[PDB]
Amino acid sequence: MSDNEDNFDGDDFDDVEEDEGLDDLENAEEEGQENVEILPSGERPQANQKRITTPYMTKYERARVLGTRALQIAMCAPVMVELEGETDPLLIAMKELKARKIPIIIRRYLPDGSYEDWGVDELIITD
């Protein structure tokens, strides 16, 4: 539709968005608990239109994101927060989450079949 949208080539973003949204441990559609995709915030989609869903990090997003970050540490990722007894990637993920040191984009699916970009930065966390 847009010039820099369809006629945009010459990009160098190295990443592979594989099938996501279906978590093995996280799966329970309920009010306030939407199915979302955990993506790494690379550019952070922005626009001149206000988002329509909730800018928060429910137990859903929190769990999905925690496991994601806990996976990063497992992959030899350094912690960006202090450890007051934490030593486990998840435990520490909670520390970083509560500290909002987790750079990630939460793609929440809409009941219509679409999705919305939600960066943790634009999300009001509850940890």
Phi first, then psi: what are they for 86, rounded to 5°? -75, 145
CA distance 49 to 78: 35
d(CA 83, CA 103) in angstroms, rounded, equals 19
The CATH architecture one would assign to domain 3-125 is Alpha-Beta Complex (3.90)
Residues pairing with 125 in the sheet: 57
Amino acid at 6: D
Burial, 100: exposed, middle or buried (Cβ in 10 Å; 0-12, 13-18, 19+)?
Answer: middle
Residues 34-63 as b/e (b if ≥16 CB within 10 A, e otherwise) read bbbbbbebeeeeeeeeeeeeeebbbebbbb
> Technique behind this structure?
NMR
* Sequence spans of domains, the chain: 3-125
Closest of 73, 119, 107 to residue 93, by C-alpha:
73
Extract the tokens encoding 5. Answer: 């949208």
The DSSP string of 55-103 is -EE-HHHHHHHHHHHHHHHHTTPPPSS--SS--SHHHHHHHHHHTT---
